[PDB]
Design an enzyme around this catalytic site. Sequence first.
Site: not given
Lengths: 111, 231, 241, 243, 240, 195, 250, 235, 244
Positions: D29-31, D74
């Site tokens: 996932g994204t930060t 995340s």
Amino acid sequence: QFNPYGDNGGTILGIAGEDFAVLAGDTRNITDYSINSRYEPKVFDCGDNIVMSANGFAADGDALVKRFKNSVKWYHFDHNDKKLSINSAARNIQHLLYGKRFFPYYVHTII
Amino acid sequence: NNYDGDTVTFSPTGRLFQVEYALEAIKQGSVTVGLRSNTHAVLVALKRNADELSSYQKKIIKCDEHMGLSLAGLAPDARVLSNYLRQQCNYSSLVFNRKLAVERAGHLLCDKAQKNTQSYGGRPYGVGLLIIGYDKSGAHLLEFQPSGNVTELYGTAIGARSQGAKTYLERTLDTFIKIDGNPDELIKAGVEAISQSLRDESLTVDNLSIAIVGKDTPFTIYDGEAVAKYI
Amino acid sequence: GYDRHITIFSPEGRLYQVEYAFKATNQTNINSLAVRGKDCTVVISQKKVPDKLLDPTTVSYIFCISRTIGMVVNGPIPDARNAALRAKAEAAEFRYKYGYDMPCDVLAKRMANLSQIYTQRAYMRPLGVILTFVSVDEELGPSIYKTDPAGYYVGYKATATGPKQQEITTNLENHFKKSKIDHINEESWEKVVEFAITHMIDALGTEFSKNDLEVGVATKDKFFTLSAENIEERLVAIAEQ
Amino acid sequence: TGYDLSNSVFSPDGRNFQVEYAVKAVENGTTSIGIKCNDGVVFAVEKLITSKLLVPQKNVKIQVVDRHIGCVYSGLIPDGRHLVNRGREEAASFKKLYKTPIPIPAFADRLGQYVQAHTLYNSVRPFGVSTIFGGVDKNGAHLYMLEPSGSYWGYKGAATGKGRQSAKAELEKLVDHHPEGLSAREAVKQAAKIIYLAHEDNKEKDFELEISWCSLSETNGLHKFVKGDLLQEAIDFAQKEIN
Amino acid sequence: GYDRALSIFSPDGHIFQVEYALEAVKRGTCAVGVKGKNCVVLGCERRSTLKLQDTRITPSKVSKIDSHVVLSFSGLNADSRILIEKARVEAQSHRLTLEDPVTVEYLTRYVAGVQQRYTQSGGVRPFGVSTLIAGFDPRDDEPKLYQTEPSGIYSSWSAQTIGRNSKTVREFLEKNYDRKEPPATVEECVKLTVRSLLEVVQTGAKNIEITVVKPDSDIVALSSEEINQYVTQIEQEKQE
Amino acid sequence: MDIILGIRVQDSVILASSKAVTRGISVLKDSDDKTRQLSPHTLMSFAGEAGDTVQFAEYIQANIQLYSIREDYELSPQAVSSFVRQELAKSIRSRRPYQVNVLIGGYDKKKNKPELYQIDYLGTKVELPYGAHGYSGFYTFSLLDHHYRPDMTTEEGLDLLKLCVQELEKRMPMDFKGVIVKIVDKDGIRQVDDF
Amino acid sequence: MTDRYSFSLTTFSPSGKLGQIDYALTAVKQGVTSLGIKATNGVVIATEKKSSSPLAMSETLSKVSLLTPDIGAVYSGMGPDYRVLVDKSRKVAHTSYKRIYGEYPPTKLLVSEVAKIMQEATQSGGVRPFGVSLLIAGHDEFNGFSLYQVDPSGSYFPWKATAIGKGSVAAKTFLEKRWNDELELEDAIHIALLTLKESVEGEFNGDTIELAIIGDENPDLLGYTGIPTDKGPRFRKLTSQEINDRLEAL
Amino acid sequence: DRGVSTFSPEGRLFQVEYSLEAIKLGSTAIGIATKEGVVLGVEKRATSPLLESDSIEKIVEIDRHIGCAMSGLTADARSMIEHARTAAVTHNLYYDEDINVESLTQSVCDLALRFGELMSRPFGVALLIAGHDADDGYQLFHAEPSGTFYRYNAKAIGSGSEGAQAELLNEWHSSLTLKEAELLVLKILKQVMEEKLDENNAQLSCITKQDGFKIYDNEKTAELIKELKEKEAAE
Amino acid sequence: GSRRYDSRTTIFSPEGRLYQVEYALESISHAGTAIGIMASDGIVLAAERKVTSTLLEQDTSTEKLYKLNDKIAVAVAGLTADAEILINTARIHAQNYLKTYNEDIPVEILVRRLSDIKQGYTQHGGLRPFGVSFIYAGYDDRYGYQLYTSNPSGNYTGWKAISVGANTSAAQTLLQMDYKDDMKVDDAIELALKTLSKTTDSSALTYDRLEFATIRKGANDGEVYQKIFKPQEIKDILVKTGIT
Ligand SMILES: [Cl-]
Ligand SMILES: [Mg+2]
């Protein structure tokens, strides 16, 4: 002991012509000997050229009208936007009212 | 492979295969397009038929006077989710005398789809949805995926060959966003967008399905001779 | 071989899921120790804070279950907290139902019975933890009782738990052979804590700063944990002798 | 083998492979980050702009619990939402019974026990999110990070997602260079920088920055989103530091 | 509650549990139903590997559901008791509400519906039983014979057989039974039923059971000697 | 409902039951049969609350008929009466109890003896040479104490019963429109058409 | 969520074996030796106290347990499974008997209730069998003294004397030679200590041996006086000192 | 084994797809919709000559204005018909009117996917629902175990379906009379049926606004069979 | 989920057999033999105890023969624990019938209900069947003396003489040889013991390895007595027939 019913007074009147119909009602709302409102409507356009009024105990009257208006909405969703005929509306209202046979809506309904 | 028996199992790379297989059902579904301006929001859907003797599968569903969606994938799953949306829109009206915000509509669908992806026995929903609506903060367009991921967009498209329409809308973004106070021109842009996803077949009178909602326009669907104007 | 996945018997009468839950105990790589004084029961445990971004005050494997009962866990923190919350609820309910504070050994039994259920019922996994309960019981005096994933429990004169448990165990065994008694013959709890730390230093062979240890002390009518400065004061006393 | 096919099964190591597999979904996932400051906490997240067709500022990922707690995560976004929905129910019942708003450590365990409960049975799947959260209570500021296993600790700084190592390194410098403490307005600016620096590990698609904060002085102890002039000021600070 | 879907579809479009239940029926002892002009006759095989039996008390193969309807079966014996009980209860329940005994078609339809429910209910396996249901409707002289099976399908038959070696006895009945002219009398109908069983049975001693049902609740079971007379008569005519 | 009588003689049980069905100030029917055949040699008469009576009688009838089919065997009058008593004994502690009183007249084929059981709505069973429910008993019991003999014939039992009906017609306030009489013996149940 | 294991985990194999019961019996075989001997005026039950660590206080762990004032129990196999069975056995003696008849159950019936619990773990959904064999010694007025064995299957048998667990095969042979129908209680205690020494390897004293009797009534252990009919519990656990006294004249 | 409500990698439910194979094994059923009415016809397919063919009930009444034909595991259809009949009558009770054919079909199709781990498996039967209402007139629907339904001008289901559907494609036009449609069903049934078509092994039915839903007698169908054979020989 | 570990106890084989029922019968075939023989004036129940130990308390023991009521008894072959569950149910069912009808339960009705319970475990619930076969010996005033057997399938049948458990094949052949219809109780006692004596896997048949019971009308005038034989009584009857 708590009494769940009340009497909000007022009166309503329906007359049918050849190619029309009227449903009239006064705009006064009361409790005991006090006036609550001089203009509180109780005759409603419910859609599909049906007008309705449930006079007596206003809480029960509003609850019933609200449920019927909602019944009309779901009739459209479930039956391809078909127009609810006055005879079909009447029968639908019977089931609404009789559903509370043992704790009634204290209203005299006219459509 | 060994981690696609049910939705409760993660793969070694952290994937949910049953959710991805449900996502695959959408790609097999017929194309549908969504786009909006500041005043109106439009759905355009290519309907599909079994053969020439059959009817064309209805893709667009109304949820309230101010909201509705188009579907792509398993139609019965769209019926379940749309019915849930109808109830939530209706609950907001009866209890709070409040039209349900399109953003909350998305949030509720996300949470409903999610519960199916974390429990044994159940399965993910096998359908993607494009929700349009007009509420207190103007026109809206949402994209629902059965993983749970809901996304607010200016325009989009889902189904088979949806990449053609999605590229077109990505180019046309600056043009169609400013089609304010003009329903027919916003629809035209949507009909031109879905045309980029056509192969061999063209848009006919009983094939095309259009819906619109806006500032002074309730959610209404157009089929049959009513869409002949836009071919 | 699905007899290794759930808690049912293998052909040789073993529960492999229980045995693997025991191996989860050492996943944290922390060693604990417990000893009894005359008036008190002291428990000590290693404190390892590898990440610099962690708030070291929130890193703990010692729990205050009730006013009188304290508990140290050897195992992963999620399962540790699962056990701690349940022990707190059980101890509170016991007081409400029966009108007196739950004894250390009775709580140990209750948690052990719960652990036993997970070894017999299939849908529930065992917790990968070893629970060491300590108190000064009003009837039995200084008490150490320990629970494991098998549902086994017993009282202890002293005990140790962790990867290097055996080294600590034999260190303590040799002391009680020499002293000829069941406890640390010491008046103040301060010197019992000093004993505990000293014998852990000898057994493990490592030196400790104030932030490398975590100490819990049980006295009559209260159990409490020591702050970094309370331990530092204690480390200074050992060094100056 | 087959020990990784079912949740709640111990391997011969003493490990639950299904939870470790859920961690892989989080790493994908994204930060997202969290910074503890003088009198509060700051949260920030990377929002990947997949297309021009995404409406800016209108796909909000940071969520509020009660009126004083902020949550960001995340991994699988729906799983995070399910966890926040529970968090809100937990915080509501605490306030209902005990009157006072839920303390942050109390709130942390409520999520921790709930996530841990999803590692106890094979009929449920572990959570596919690491959740950074915190706020301000009677005892001051608290920052927490919760993982798929149910493991959580208090943090001075926290980071998770695809650019976690980059963000952790940058966080460790702030802790070293500011022992006395970091201010709330500073932490917002630093948060922006760290997301921009952590974006180097996800640099195909360009992104949208989103920041929130709780502070006893700046927001009066309540959770608020950073918007308008204060947001643009933080973006400009971050843009200046990358060049 | 135990929920498992035991009866499910396979790639080729078959429900194997229902099909394996039919194999249990094929294993069971043979049962035959023949309807005449004014009667129906139910014949049943009884395997002769069991000597030292007590035939007074041993469960009879043909069961009365009401005074006017009977039910024989092939397949699992224990399963058949459950269907018979349920049918008997429904027969009394129908009398209570409709003030009229069940038709043979209605009773069949109920039993068939129960069998079907067990093919798409969780936690249960299908009934390893096929039934022959025979009788006369109230105030009616037209003979009725119906068949049911594990899947839940049912249908009416002029004559039919089920159980082990039923395909042999069905072959016999298919050429020997005339639609235009069914067995005019009771004797003719019983003889054709016994003849059909004698193709399969072994010996005509204590291996064949015969039950005759006539209109207006007139049901009687034949004894050994009565049946043995038909066996003796058929064999003497055969030697020609 | 109102009048139900029973007399057990040497070789039979005779049940007499009133024909009137009254509601309010109107006799709605004057040919009502207040009885059900439970089995070929067992008859039950009934009286009490409107609706409850027939609903209960038919419910019992169904259960006995079900037993008969299952076992291919007739239950003894003693066994049927015990079953009926238990049903009423359950009923009395229900939310809404069956307010039904019954007489069970039967011929035991194994003992070759007639049997008469009187059971009230509470579940109070007694075997008797003669029985009655309601106000009828206040006249008929003392009458039968005097005129009854245990060794009487069926014809003597019918004359004894005529004596009861005559007394009830003379002294009862309500018009009960005569009675339907039925005899239970070794040959089963039959109705006397001219009474 | 919820217990989805509503199906049997113990099933018949093609050979007719119930695998999980056989495997439970294998677990009992591994367990420490325990035994029971019936005398004319009493019963003795005994076992070794296998200490997990010398730092552990073996007094706190009780392998021999009182179930009723006149009934006691000992086991071989898995200790945790035993502990919960003792809890359930004590409770069932009250709920299904004492709260009905106002008196404690006879040995055979309490045994029957314990057996029922162990049988249900063999057939019910989502559970394994208990991994223990119990020896239950007891007394009641109308049956006198009695000794029963209860296995993981739920089967139970009455014994004059027997042994279960590690060295049961040798211990049973030893008891066959020594047992007669004229044994006094003290003679049975003596034989129990002789039999148990064979299976024990390390230390053999009152601190490593657990032993209890079902003998005469103990008014001193009752806790009150004034009711003549109440004469005290027949179950008595022998002390560490009382065992060592009999080990000198061994 | 594997879950009942599991998706295949192609994005289809295994059990639904396998139930479709069961329906292909079933006996043929054909429906044709016209402006004068909707005709429904089926292959009876008796497994043996001793079986009394008139007891084979594969065409069924739902209400006076709605009929139904089936194909596949016909035992599974009983509860579907029961639900349809209750739905139709219940709607008439609540609204004092006839229920729309589409609304009826939708109500039946809601049962379809109510299976999993509710019933244990999907239905193994497809239905042709034919009817008439005031709004949309004469209608024919094909209801599957997937929960999906399509409206058709004409449709064939069962073992001879793909062959019959190709034949219906050519023969159907929007000006077909009822008599023409009756013959067309008989013609196409005779082509795909194994055994030779007659009044005993095939059944006709129709629904008209005036007379409602009617199953044809064996005498009436026989004359239509004789009328069909003469017309084909006439050119 | 849990599907992975389900044995599916209530399914059919491709051949149309119930796996678990067949395997339960295989279990029962290793259990101690039990014989029932019905005479004109009574019934005999004989059963062999499973490999006895010398230290087993023989007099205060019950393994094979159990009393259901005053008129009905059963002989067990299989898992004892399983049998005791079913016995307590049967004992209750008999008392329910007595409470309802004020008459002792007919033998077949009790047998049918107990057999219906076993049937249920083969069709639904996902549980293993009861690994038990019963021989029912009883009396009622309808059919008089009756012998029945039921097995894990829930199927029951009536018998003049029958065996269950081990060596039934050999035992049934010997009974079929020497049995006749005008037989007395004392003759049936002798037949039961002689049959066990030949079919036994032991070296020699002794009193300590047997349970024995009779149901006679040998009480005083038109009433039935159940006699569960004591150890010394079995010893005497074994000498009287000349086996020891
Ligand atoms: Cl407990
Ligand atoms: Mg009375």
